[PDB]
Amino acid sequence: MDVAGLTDCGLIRKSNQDAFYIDEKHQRFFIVADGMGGEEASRLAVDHIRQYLETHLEDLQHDPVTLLRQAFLAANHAIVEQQRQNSARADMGTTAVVILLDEKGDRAWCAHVGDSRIYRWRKDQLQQITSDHTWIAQAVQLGSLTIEQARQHPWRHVLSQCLGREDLSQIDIQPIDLEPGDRLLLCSAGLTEELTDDVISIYLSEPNVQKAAAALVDAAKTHGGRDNVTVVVISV
Ligand SMILES: [Ca+2]
Ligand SMILES: [Ca+2]
Ligand SMILES: [Mg+2]
Ligand SMILES: [Mg+2]
């Protein structure tokens, strides 16, 4: 498999509070986080999830749901501890999206908290796997609010879940089976606020994943680059 990752401050923001990690050694897991002390929070999330998976993958890869829940909870606690040991950054928080591949490499466990996304691409069609933890997306799902005005709503990106909360309740985890030639995309909402799914799907069709990742970021900036933007692209 091939993988590429890229983060960019974008054209407007003063600093980049997104972070990411790719397991380049063994290609087992991939992480993107979007902070909001947001830089501390996203860095804690990425580091703690990485270290937890590195440590427990061997023992727990047979129970990926428990492994992922425990990794996310470790990150959550680390952020909450720093909130307590820090009045200034008392409300710091971050999203996270994680893919953990099984040993064989043709199943991706997708885990997330927040409005960063995982997508799967296949033969020029793109599917969003994760459902945003936003008050707005919850409306579209269970009630009155179309994707039409939801994508236009001003509270579009207010989070209903984030890492860094004592009362973290929801960690969404689901498996997806993979076929050769599939692409997986982990991204912060800096990408999807600028690029429609149709546009994203085109850049993902670029055979070279390093080129696809760079093109996605460049495209997000050419479209306005209003926020930090991070992508990880995996070719199966
Ligand atoms: Ca942010
Ligand atoms: Ca954001
Ligand atoms: Mg097959
Ligand atoms: Mg724009």
Side-chain angles (χ1 to χ4, degrees), residues 1-12 14-57 59-84 88 90 92-122 124-140 143 146 149-150 153-165 168 170-210 212-217 219-236:
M1 74 166 17
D2 299 313
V3 61
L6 193 51
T7 188
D8 198 292
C9 192
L11 301 182
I12 300 300
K14 280 167 280 176
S15 73
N16 191 358
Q17 299 193 333
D18 277 8
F20 76 95
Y21 179 77
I22 296 168
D23 171 18
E24 297 284 357
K25 193 62 176 188
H26 303 291
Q27 293 183 146
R28 292 295 305 274
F29 64 87
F30 315 84
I31 312 165
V32 170
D34 173 8
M36 69 223 186
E39 173 151 11
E40 173 158 29
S42 65
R43 175 195 45 89
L44 280 173
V46 177
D47 286 341
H48 276 279
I49 292 164
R50 170 183 61 86
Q51 290 177 296
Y52 199 94
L53 300 177
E54 290 177 345
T55 298
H56 297 277
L57 194 46
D59 309 311
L60 281 182
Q61 61 180 332
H62 61 94
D63 189 356
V65 171
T66 297
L67 173 58
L68 286 163
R69 287 184 50 79
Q70 284 170 16
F72 275 66
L73 288 168
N76 189 236
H77 281 297
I79 301 165
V80 164
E81 285 300 309
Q82 297 302 142
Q83 291 176 348
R84 291 171 180 162
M92 66 173 150
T94 185
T95 70
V97 279
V98 175
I99 293 178
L100 166 67
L101 299 169
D102 78 336
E103 244 178 349
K104 166 59 197 184
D106 55 32
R107 161 167 297 191
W109 288 92
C110 299
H112 88 290
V113 173
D115 69 347
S116 295
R117 292 176 179 169
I118 298 161
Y119 286 86
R120 190 267 293 286
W121 179 97
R122 172 186 290 172
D124 305 303
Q125 304 300 314
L126 185 64
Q127 186 184 10
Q128 191 181 312
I129 303 305
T130 55
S131 282
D132 289 1
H133 300 133
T134 58
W135 305 113
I136 296 307
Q138 292 179 359
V140 179
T146 302
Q149 65 269 26
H153 197 291
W155 297 331
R156 212 175 303 137
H157 286 288
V158 53
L159 299 184
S160 58
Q161 301 278 352
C162 66
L163 291 177
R165 294 305 183 258
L168 177 73
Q170 186 168 178
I171 303 163
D172 279 18
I173 301 167
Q174 69 175 295
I176 67 172
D177 289 342
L178 309 170
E179 285 299 312
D182 284 356
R183 266 96 189 282
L184 292 159
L185 166 68
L186 298 85
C187 68
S188 69
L191 182 76
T192 47
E193 268 301 320
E194 297 291 350
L195 309 185
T196 62
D197 283 7
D198 280 1
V199 169
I200 294 172
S201 185
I202 301 164
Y203 288 116
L204 288 178
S205 81
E206 162 59 34
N208 184 308
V209 302
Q210 287 70 211
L216 281 165
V217 168
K221 290 152 72 183
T222 300
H223 277 80
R226 302 283 306 178
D227 205 350
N228 299 338
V229 58
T230 305
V231 303
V232 172
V233 180
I234 296 150
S235 196
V236 176

